[PDB]
Each structure stands twice: as C-alpha cells, then as structure tokens.
RNA sequence: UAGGAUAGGGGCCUACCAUGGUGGUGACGGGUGACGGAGAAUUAGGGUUCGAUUCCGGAGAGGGAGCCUGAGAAACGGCUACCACAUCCAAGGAAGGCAGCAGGCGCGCAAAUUACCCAAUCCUGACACGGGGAGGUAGUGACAAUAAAUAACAAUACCGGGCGCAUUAGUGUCUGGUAAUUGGAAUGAGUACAAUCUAAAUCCCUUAACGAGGAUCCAUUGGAGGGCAAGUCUGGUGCCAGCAGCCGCGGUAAUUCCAGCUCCAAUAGCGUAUAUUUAAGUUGUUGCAGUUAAAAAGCUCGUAGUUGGACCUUGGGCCGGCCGGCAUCGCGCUCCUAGCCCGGCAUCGUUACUUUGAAGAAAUUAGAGUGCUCAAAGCAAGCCAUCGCUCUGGAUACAUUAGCAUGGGAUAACAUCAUAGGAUUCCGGUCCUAUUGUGUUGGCCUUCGGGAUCGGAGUAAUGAUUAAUAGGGACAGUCGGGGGCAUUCGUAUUUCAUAGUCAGAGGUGAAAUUCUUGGAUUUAUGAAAGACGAACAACUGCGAAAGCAUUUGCCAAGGAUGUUUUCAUUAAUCAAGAACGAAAGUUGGGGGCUCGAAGACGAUCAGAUACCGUCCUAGUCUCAACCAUAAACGAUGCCGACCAGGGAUCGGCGGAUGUUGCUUAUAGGACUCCGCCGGCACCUUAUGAGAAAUCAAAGUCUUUGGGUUCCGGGGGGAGUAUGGUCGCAAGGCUGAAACUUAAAGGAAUUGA
RNA sequence: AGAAGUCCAUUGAACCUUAUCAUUUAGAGGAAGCAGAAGUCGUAACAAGGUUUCCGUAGGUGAACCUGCGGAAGGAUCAUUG
RNA sequence: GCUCUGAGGACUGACAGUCGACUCAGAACUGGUACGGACAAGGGGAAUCCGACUGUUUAAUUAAAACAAAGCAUUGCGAUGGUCCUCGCGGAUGCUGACGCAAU
RNA sequence: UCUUAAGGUAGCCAAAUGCCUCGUCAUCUAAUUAGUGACGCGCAUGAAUGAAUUAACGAGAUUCCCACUGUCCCUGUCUA
C-alpha cells in the first residue's frame, strides 16, 4: 500500500479497453502536437498538459490519439522536463516544508514529514540516476535546493 | 509484492476445498497457463478461459472437484533427474499418483515426463 | 517466520550458528568449562581420602549418607565422594588411594544426597565391589 | 622502475617514485583439549559429532639459530654456537640428544617383549651373494570382530492335557518337568606317538592308545514397585543402615534395604563412569515456536542483505517405424567436416540451471564372482583320463563442491537501441603493405586483395510491450478533538477587598490536629493569579506510535475518495545509521491556583514508618537542554492472495422520489432507499485452527515452502558481575558464568 | 696453493632492562546468590486477601512494603435505550 | 669533523640564460666510542591531606591549608526609598533604577 | 519505658577532628609510635559553621620506590 503511511486505498484511473480513439475524436495529430508544444512552452508540466487536453479539447488519451505519450512528444520536440516531473514536485514540497520549519522549530510532526519527503526524493533520484534521466552525480543538496524549483 | 503461481494455486485449493465451480485468478503467466495445462492434461481440472482484455490478464478455471491439493514450492529448488525420485516421495501422497511440476528446458512439465525425456529442472510446484 | 529466499544461505547458516548457543548442552560442551571442572575432561580420577565425613539427606528422605572428602592428585581439587553400599564405608580409610568415578546423571548430583556428584569404586587399588562381595580383600 | 640474490618468478632484498592493500560477503585479533585429507560412528531423508593413528600431503627431532658434504639435507641414528638437562673425569679436559625397536623413571583413569629372523614384501650396496628392530614370526592381549561347547536319545516311573470310548473309563501321545532317576551311545575341552606347519620352533588343520554320570570336565553379569520381563514368598532391620539413573522404599505385617528359595533378562559376556550419535519436529533447510506457556523490537525512516507483477512463436504440421529429418513469412557465409546446384560452418552479450563426457589414487563404502567348512574374511579358485596343462578371474558403482567440455534453452539474475554514433548488396577518396607477370633475393608503383578512415545515394513494415484490484506524482471537492504560531472564552478553585449575620464550621463509621466572637463557615458584588477545558462525548474521528477536545486566523502538511492526467517497476522488509517517543526524572530562567512523593502532625493499631484527615517541599504548568524507558497492549511485526454471513457507523463518491420552518425557483444542505471503495469495530456459525480460553482471521500446517525482519530453547541465578559504549545524574544499550533445582508455567474441570 | 689471525657485512641464537597481552592464584574487609535446620519479627501476595492487582519512574521505610505522577486489566464492570 | 648526493626558488626570453641567502633529508671516510665536548639546561614514579585553578598576604622571623575568587544562596529597597557620611547646611551609591544599588 | 523543641538523616573516620592510643585486622618492613586500605558505642564527625568526592594545579603537609650523590661508613686532598 501507500508507502509512507498505512493507507491501503485503491482509487485510481481505469483506462478504457479500446486503444483506438473514439469516433468523435477526429483531432489531427499534427494539431495536437502543436497543442502539446504550445501548452509545454507555456511553462507547464505533462500532468497539467494531459489534464487540459482531457478537459478542454476533449482528447481522451494522447496515446490513443497519437500513439506517442506526452513525455515522448515533448522529448521529440525538445521541451522535456529538465528535472523529471515528480522529483520536481517532491523537491518543491520539501523546500516549502523546510521554509515553514525554519520558522517553526517546534513542529515535530513536520520534522517527521520532511524526513519522509527527503527519503522519497532520494529513492526517486536513485531510480532516475540508474535510468540516465539525471546527470550521474546530480545530488539533492538541501542548501542548493530552493533555486532548482519554483 | 507478488509471487504468483501462488496467488493462483492457493486460490484453486481454497476454492476446491470449499467446493466452488469456477475460480478466477487475477494475475496470469506463461507459467500459469503451462501449469494449468499440466493439471488438465493429467485430468485434474476441466477447461479454463483466459480473459486477456488488455492488462496483466485473468483466468477462470472450471473445477471438477477431483483435485485434492496443489501447492507451489516457492523457493524454486534445482532438481537433477536423480533426485526427481526423492522429492516424489517427499512431497507426494504415494508412489502411484500425484505429480511434481518442474520447469525444464523443454517447457513446464511434470516429473514422469521429465524422467522420460531425461532432463532436470527447477520445481515449480505439485498437485495431487 | 523463516527466510526461504534462494540466496539467503548465508543468513540461515549464520542464524543457526548464533542460535545453537541458546541450547544448554551445546553451550556446555563448546564453552570449555568441562576443562575447569574437577576431572577436567576425565572419565575417572584417582585421589587420596582426607576424611570420611557423612552428609545429611534431602528433605523427603532422612539419613546420613556416608561420603568421603577426597583430594584429586591430577589437579589438586577437593571433593566429596559417596561410598556405595551397606557397611562398605569401613573399608575406606583416611589417606587411602581411591578412584573417584562418576556417580551418575552425567555430572549432576543424584538422589537424596545434597551436593555430591562422585562415587568411590576403588580403594588401595582393590575393587570396592570385590570387598563388598568378599571376592578379593585388600 | 632500475638492480641485486636465487635454479627460477617474486618486495625475496636494495635505491628512487607513487600511497596504496584489506574490511558487515567478518579483515585484523582472540580460542581451540586444531596437523589437512581419504575416511569413522550414528543415520528413513536432511544431518550431528569425530578424524593421534598404519594410505597420501605437511611438519619435527629438548628449544631456537647457522652451516659443510652432496643431484638431493638448513639433515640431528652430520657438524657449529647459545639456553635447559645431564654423563665420564686420573680435576686437565671430553662426549652428548630413543617423537627408531625393546626397555626403565615419571606422569597419569589409561597402554605388551630389554625375544627370533631376513624365509616371505620391498629397499639398499661396487651387489645373484652382505644388510635391513623396514618388515615378518613367536610372547602378554575379553581394544574391537567371527564361528561356537557346557549335553543327546530312550523306555521305567508319582504324575500332567488330548488322542484309542469318551461316556464311566482310564493311563497315552508329542515326552513337558522333579527325577544324584536306569541304560547302553557320541564327542571335544584336556593329555598325547607322530606327521604337517615354520627361516627354526609354535598356534592351527589332521590324527595311534588315553580322555563323562551329572557332585562333575560345575556359567556368569545385572535385577524381581513402576518406566522394564520377572515374588501381595520366608527371616532380620526399624525414616537407622541402606536402596533408588527419575518417581519413590525405609517412622514394627519393607514385593524396593540386608539375606535364603524361586523367577527373569542377556549369556562368554554383562554393569558402572565420561565423550558422543539416535531418541530430539528439545536446533527444526527438509522440520519448531512468539495472544495467554520461553519468546514480535515503542514506533517509523533507512543503506548494504534477502525478495521482486505481466509480456517477446517454436503457434499448425508432413514424415518413418520419443526423436531423426523436414515447410511456412530460416541476415550471409568464402575455411575443415564439405550432396546422387545439396543437410549440418567458425569468430562480432555474460552467467546461473540441467544433460551427457572426460579426468577422476588405492584401502574404506555398496556390489558381482568364488564352499577359507560356515562366518568376519580373503582375492582367490575350478575340471582334467582331477598323467607332462587347460579354463581363468582379480568386474562395476559412488565421489557433494570447484575446474574442462557437448547439447537443451523453460525458469531467474547481471548486462542493454531512441541523441540512432543503428542494420543493409553496392559504389572511390584519404594510405599502406606484394603473390602468381620480380624463371635469382627482392624492393616504392598501373586495373587488383585486406586493414583503418571516409563523404553521398539505396533499401527495410525503418527503430520505445501494456499502463498492474503494485508505486510515486499531478488536479478537484472534501474530511479530521493530526501539527505549529498567535488568539477570543468559560464557570469553578485559591487569595483578596467590600457588605450582612452571629456560634459554630472543616472532617469521618467516628474523632482531633485546623479555622472561629482579631467574626470562621455561610450570602452577594468586584478584582487578581494560574491551572483544567465539564455536560455534548459515542464500542466515534485524526495520528507512525507516544498521543490529540473552548473560539477565530495564518502557516505548512495527510489518509480516503473521484479521475478516459502523468512517469513506468521506480517496489517489500530492512544488520549499520536516523527521527519522534507518555509519565517520572535532571540542569536553568518564568509561574507558584488546585493537587502533592519527602517531611511534620491527628487518629487507628500490639505496633502503623500505611490505609483515614489536616499542613506541605520538590513537583504538577510554560521555555531552553537532556533522558529514552511503560501492562509503550490488540500482551497479535510489515507487505500480499484467497476463504462466510449480516446490519450498524465514519469519510468520499454514484444512482433513486419526497419534504423541507432553508432556497428569486431547481441545485445544493437536513432526512429516507440502494451500491461501490477505504477505516475502527461489532454480532451468529463451524465446513476450519488450537492445549484450550478463544480466533472469521490467531484460517487456508505432518496433504507441512509467497516475501521479509526481530526473537525464545526448563525454572532460577539474572537483566545480575564484568568489559564496552551513550548520559551531567538517575539511568539506557550490549551482557555471561559458577552454583542451585525437578519441576516452574498455560488452559480448562470438580470441590473447598 | 695455503693455516692462525683480522676486517666490513648478513643470518643470528642467548642473556638483560622496560612496556604489554593472556592463563592461573593470595588478600583484611564489603557485598551477592543458593541450600539446610524443629529459629526471630511481621502479613506483603493468592477471595473485594480486607488499601483491587501489576507496569515505568521518584522518594521513604526493620522487613515485607507505602505514597506520588502516568499506564494497563492479566479487574471485582464486556451494560444506561432502564 | 671532512667529502659528497638529493629536495625545496627568483628574474629574463613544459625549454634555455643569469642569479640565490638559506633550511631539510640521506651515504661515505675518520677518531684512543668522542661528539647539546665550554656555556645553557626538567630528576622520575605510586599515594594521602588541604585549597578548585591564576591571583594577594604579616615592608624587618610566619607565603600558608590563610585571604580573594568564579559558582550558589540569603536580605533590604520602586525616589515621599534602601545602605552610608555631616557639627550643621548637605552629600556618596547616582552621568544611578531591580539584568540596579546595598548588606551578608 | 523515661525523656525532648528535635533526638546526628545521607554520608565519613584513630582523618589537620579519637582522651583511651603505640585502637583491632591487612599491607609496606629483617625490624615501623610512621603511611596507606579497612572495621566504628565516634572523649568531642556530620551536612552552604557546609557533608562526601574530585581531573588540573601547588616555592603547601606527609609516606614509599628507581636513578643519584662525602649525608654517612670515614675521612683525605686541592684552589681563591
Ligand atoms: Mg518500506
Ligand atoms: Mg492495494
Ligand atoms: Mg523429590
Ligand atoms: Mg626485477
Ligand atoms: Mg596441538
Ligand atoms: Mg605420515
Ligand atoms: Mg623427548
Ligand atoms: Mg627435518
Ligand atoms: Mg637440525
Ligand atoms: Mg636417535
Ligand atoms: Mg620405544
Ligand atoms: Mg540385590
Ligand atoms: Mg531382594
Ligand atoms: Mg522396576
Ligand atoms: Mg512386569
Ligand atoms: Mg544401579
Ligand atoms: Mg528396584
Ligand atoms: Mg534443549
Ligand atoms: Mg537437551
Ligand atoms: Mg518447541
Ligand atoms: Mg510470555
Ligand atoms: Mg535496500
Ligand atoms: Mg463573614
Ligand atoms: Mg468527531
Ligand atoms: Mg467543551
Ligand atoms: Mg522494553
Ligand atoms: Mg511487548
Ligand atoms: Mg508491537
Ligand atoms: Mg455511509
Ligand atoms: Mg462502509
Ligand atoms: Mg531459559
Ligand atoms: Mg505468566
Ligand atoms: Mg491455572
Ligand atoms: Mg496479605
Ligand atoms: Mg491488597
Ligand atoms: Mg486483584
Ligand atoms: Mg510514606
Ligand atoms: Mg504521608
Ligand atoms: Mg590556591
Ligand atoms: Mg601562568
Ligand atoms: Mg614577614
Ligand atoms: Mg616569609
Ligand atoms: Mg540619597
Ligand atoms: Mg550513623
Ligand atoms: Mg555537633
Ligand atoms: Mg573516628
Ligand atoms: Mg620511614
Ligand atoms: Mg587510615
Ligand atoms: Mg557529635
Ligand atoms: Mg561544626
Ligand atoms: Mg605551596
């Protein structure tokens, strides 16, 4: 279950069977490459990109329309995340926690939470460094962490 | 975590010891299908339908209630074709029936087939 | 429960090695103290009698079990040693050479005798059974 | 690196340079009553213990060190020196080394001959020829192992059961026993002419005359309450002596002691003692246990360790009686093996697994053959017309691992194609070697062969498995007494002040200490201080556990749910390491309401250091810093799967009409019905489990294996001594042994 | 060629001072545990054991023990819709 | 002591030219085993008692265990006040104010 | 049981505090009124008159040991 708390929930997305896009999705894959690149150049990460297509422009799945995932479109056009998405978000979270905690020295439960967040950053960074998506000596320096995000 | 071929074998044991007619197995495998084939071929379960929609997969087996037990010896040992014979006594109810299913380089297959083809392997499980 | 991993042979051998020590018999044999015991890893042990003493018997019984304090000539220890049979104690005498055997129960005191682990089977090199059964007198 | 030295590599040594090597996969050190191995015991399988020893390898000659002779020695049945020990001495000096055979001292529980011989096996010499305490033989030998005597057969007899009838007899058949009963048979233990054996004697195997009357040619060792097979026999003893491995016997009717008769067990053996194997599934890999019996770390994070989801053609087959060989939609072959244009050919990922093979020292282990008489053995031996030699054997098996090799390629690791620096028949350019056209050696060079580089055209289906009822992350509305900082609020208590009023009040079962006409208690009003957050408050929520209840705000975080978002194995549990950790406690500021260890009093009591009451210190509260334990409890580690039923309830979500003291009308919110998740639980039931109480998870276990961590091995001693280490201190973490003991303990049943 | 002697080297016993490690053994006194025997004093615990039991911590007491603060039930309550 | 070896730099145009006062390693040879050769220059250890330490003290017999000390504690005082001086008027602490003054 | 306002608690000791006294036991010694470690009916120890310890320090008081020396045995001699 949930790694850093004993919750055991199973809520998630369940993708429809038909890999082929539904009829009313007549979207032109060149035009959705334009849409992705416009949304990414707008500063935005793949999660929000996928949300905007799902909700605004009615694109069920980028891979059902195009056959190419959001990240691999962005990599092909050179707009990828320089820090991979979820590691980015974990670093942003830990910077926020630590900025609060330097003002509240007696908030021990957030000392625990920050230890958990940095544990999680380090596990995910170990993975990315074995998969060659980060430089092999990229190290999460808590001091020089606030620049790299937000 | 999972070590399926257990999620499945203990599911069929539970279902059959209770007396259910059809059991469904949430993960599948080449090992699962090749294992159930050994059971069916030796005549212990009837047919089974493999729901492969698009995911890990799913199986539903239709039991005859004629199987009595099946187990996975996770901790898959190694097994030469001479100590086939001191497992067949070690795990099985007798020297007559019951089969030990050993993965061998000629696919997943039971121990008498293994002796006839003169190969060893690694024990996956057994049933009787 | 158990570690049944295939690559955990080291873990299980080390576990059995560390836990074989909480067994009393193994710890007793492989800790070495049999070699600080009075026989120091001996079957019997010859010695000299210092005095025939006589020691009471534990509570359910009531007696004067006739023991002899002997000294071991191999290592200088002094111990007590029962003289088993009816009247047979008299054949023992102070500064007679006696072989101290085990009294039974493998190094632990036996019967109603408090704190005695040793029996006398020979005195002056003559069988103590032989003097009891008047076969061969010293 | 350079060199020296050695037979030779080498830090084996030197000079110079570099600072490396090893280590939680246990280095280094410490113990070993440790030479290593082949192997020995026990063994259902797995294992446990042992291995001085005759075969192999090493080491050593009292302890070390150094050497000559020699092919070979750092040799000791050779020397040189020192240390220990000791011998002869004519007093100057000299000679030493039994862990060789034999023997003696000593040590010890514990170990034979100061014998004979080179005849066998082999070695050695100048050598058929000498020598061999190697070796063999004789002597002591209950180390262990083998075969195996101590009587057999008869009729008489008091008898004793069928069977001749069974009746009603009587005797009668296998001979069952007490028969020193009666009797003729047989024999070797022993003795002994010999012969044979032997290198010579001897043991044996053969055998002349001896050699048996059941007292003798004599069988014992341990028992007779249970475990454990066999005395409710008879005398003695009187909780004495004594037995008894454990339970127990013995205090005057002792089956247990001590004895006689009887019986039992094994029987040329049997007990005792210690070590050790089995028993022991009480060391549990196969194969234990952790709710309550011994035992889940307080809780979480966590590195190494261990473990890891699914997916990728051998998918249909001809073929001849398990496979050879074969097609489809088999990237190439020039080289060996290479067909009557042809199977089946090399180099351009690693292993683990398994198969077959090689090679594996003998003795041992199993196992074949063989009549040493059998046997344990041994490696012999068998028929000829047992007449001038035939037939011969002296097999095979195993050998765990590591290493070498062939084929298999399921299972699992390690490794890795999205920047295309990818693959691809071709084309020439950068440049080089050279062969038959250099009959001699050859040597730069023209189309040519090969590196290597190298640009462009070519073709290919041109190159990334899904998105786990795994995980992270994202977004949405929520939810919570989860956290921090600030903050409003509440009565009450205490003290005070103001006012009234007069004999009590407080306390208990009862009293007093106490307060009280200096007005106590009681009444009201106001103030101040500091703690606590009633009732709502639950088989309810939040939290990793500890824990968390007045209000509002800010701060950051979090589970669940919802999702046609994203990434794609990123995960589980975790020695080292790290965070939080109630109360008490310790240091120092702030506060000092109530309560209150200590302390003092008042009662009680035999006493009362206590229960009861009065006063009260530290403390109780906040802050800064420590501590690191609780019955830190669900006495139940964490992750995962399946299995039974139901209604409640908390959170979210989805679906339904039917009314609101709401709502510009619907929606929403409150309530009702249904259903999904996810919580804490709860109730009935075994078809389950278990020692049971009990448990729907403590279930899916002798039909035993999903992963992972920690931990227990009778009760004490003892969480003690010591050593270490953290702490200011109390303490915490780690943590024995001696010796003691036969029960301690769990669950339930009857009673009292 | 060659002896005695001698030189500079290398191996180096062996003796000696010190340090240090390990294995035994003495010690006035101090203080543990165990066991015995027919002892002294109490009543702590097992029933509501007459103050419910016990667990962490602090202090005190002849001894058992008491008391404070916090916890638990292994409690003498599975219960207030009465 | 003597003779050497090596290392450690500057300036000018990874090399060349010139310069460089000093320090540090190592070896040979040598002497009546003498070498910090004069000078200068700690004896060491095992324990007790006292005072924590540094400091000060009876000038001319006592240098100390005595005094001071940091640390701890106590007391008074909120200005019309506390401790103190003056014969008086007045003053010291006070150019001060409780984290202060004062007395032990 | 008398008695007090309270009966010297934690500690400590023949201590610079102990008359008895050269206390008793151990060690140091050939021999120790000394020293140290203990024992405590403490003439007359004892808690900020501060109790018990205590690393470093000390021209402080004591005791033993190693090296050292004319301090001594036991005196001699040289120089200003
Ligand atoms: Mg985890
Ligand atoms: Mg799940
Ligand atoms: Mg008993
Ligand atoms: Mg070299
Ligand atoms: Mg040895
Ligand atoms: Mg040998
Ligand atoms: Mg010797
Ligand atoms: Mg030698
Ligand atoms: Mg030698
Ligand atoms: Mg010799
Ligand atoms: Mg000998
Ligand atoms: Mg008897
Ligand atoms: Mg008898
Ligand atoms: Mg018996
Ligand atoms: Mg019997
Ligand atoms: Mg016996
Ligand atoms: Mg008996
Ligand atoms: Mg045991
Ligand atoms: Mg045992
Ligand atoms: Mg057990
Ligand atoms: Mg327990
Ligand atoms: Mg890890
Ligand atoms: Mg009034
Ligand atoms: Mg609530
Ligand atoms: Mg409230
Ligand atoms: Mg604990
Ligand atoms: Mg616990
Ligand atoms: Mg727990
Ligand atoms: Mg609900
Ligand atoms: Mg629900
Ligand atoms: Mg135990
Ligand atoms: Mg218990
Ligand atoms: Mg009970
Ligand atoms: Mg009581
Ligand atoms: Mg009580
Ligand atoms: Mg109770
Ligand atoms: Mg008290
Ligand atoms: Mg009190
Ligand atoms: Mg001073
Ligand atoms: Mg100074
Ligand atoms: Mg003076
Ligand atoms: Mg002076
Ligand atoms: Mg003034
Ligand atoms: Mg006293
Ligand atoms: Mg006084
Ligand atoms: Mg005194
Ligand atoms: Mg003296
Ligand atoms: Mg003294
Ligand atoms: Mg006094
Ligand atoms: Mg005084
Ligand atoms: Mg001084």
PDB file of N, CA, C and O (backbone and C1' of nucleotides) and ligand atoms in Angstrom, chain D residues 282 284 288-289 294 712, ligand 20:
ATOM      1  P     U D 282      10.567 -31.248  19.364  1.00  0.00           P
ATOM      2  O5'   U D 282      12.070 -30.754  19.331  1.00  0.00           O
ATOM      3  C5'   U D 282      12.388 -29.387  19.523  1.00  0.00           C
ATOM      4  C4'   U D 282      13.516 -29.224  20.504  1.00  0.00           C
ATOM      5  C3'   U D 282      14.680 -30.185  20.356  1.00  0.00           C
ATOM      6  O3'   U D 282      15.589 -29.799  19.345  1.00  0.00           O
ATOM      7  C1'   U D 282      14.059 -30.029  22.625  1.00  0.00           C
ATOM      8  P     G D 284      18.985 -28.936  13.024  1.00  0.00           P
ATOM      9  O5'   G D 284      17.508 -28.759  12.462  1.00  0.00           O
ATOM     10  C5'   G D 284      17.011 -27.483  12.092  1.00  0.00           C
ATOM     11  C4'   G D 284      15.519 -27.504  11.866  1.00  0.00           C
ATOM     12  C3'   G D 284      14.839 -26.145  11.849  1.00  0.00           C
ATOM     13  O3'   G D 284      14.823 -25.587  10.552  1.00  0.00           O
ATOM     14  C1'   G D 284      13.612 -27.686  13.198  1.00  0.00           C
ATOM     15  P     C D 288       8.882 -25.703  10.429  1.00  0.00           P
ATOM     16  O5'   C D 288       8.680 -25.736  12.000  1.00  0.00           O
ATOM     17  C5'   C D 288       8.529 -26.981  12.654  1.00  0.00           C
ATOM     18  C4'   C D 288       8.450 -26.836  14.147  1.00  0.00           C
ATOM     19  C3'   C D 288       7.690 -25.632  14.656  1.00  0.00           C
ATOM     20  O3'   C D 288       6.294 -25.849  14.659  1.00  0.00           O
ATOM     21  C1'   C D 288       9.734 -25.801  15.799  1.00  0.00           C
ATOM     22  P     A D 289       5.263 -24.622  14.648  1.00  0.00           P
ATOM     23  O5'   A D 289       5.745 -23.682  15.834  1.00  0.00           O
ATOM     24  C5'   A D 289       5.398 -23.977  17.175  1.00  0.00           C
ATOM     25  C4'   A D 289       5.940 -22.950  18.135  1.00  0.00           C
ATOM     26  C3'   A D 289       5.495 -21.515  17.933  1.00  0.00           C
ATOM     27  O3'   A D 289       4.176 -21.245  18.365  1.00  0.00           O
ATOM     28  C1'   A D 289       7.793 -21.545  18.347  1.00  0.00           C
ATOM     29  P     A D 294       6.255 -17.733  29.722  1.00  0.00           P
ATOM     30  O5'   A D 294       7.794 -18.123  29.727  1.00  0.00           O
ATOM     31  C5'   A D 294       8.805 -17.135  29.663  1.00  0.00           C
ATOM     32  C4'   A D 294       9.730 -17.389  28.503  1.00  0.00           C
ATOM     33  C3'   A D 294       9.261 -16.854  27.173  1.00  0.00           C
ATOM     34  O3'   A D 294       9.587 -15.488  27.031  1.00  0.00           O
ATOM     35  C1'   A D 294      10.151 -19.044  26.922  1.00  0.00           C
ATOM     36  P     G D 712      16.564 -14.330  22.049  1.00  0.00           P
ATOM     37  O5'   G D 712      15.383 -15.337  22.402  1.00  0.00           O
ATOM     38  C5'   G D 712      14.497 -15.091  23.482  1.00  0.00           C
ATOM     39  C4'   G D 712      13.688 -16.320  23.802  1.00  0.00           C
ATOM     40  C3'   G D 712      14.494 -17.599  23.959  1.00  0.00           C
ATOM     41  O3'   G D 712      14.954 -17.752  25.286  1.00  0.00           O
ATOM     42  C1'   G D 712      12.654 -17.973  22.511  1.00  0.00           C
TER      43        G D 712
HETATM   44 MG1  LIG H  20       9.458 -26.099  20.857  1.00  0.00          MG
END
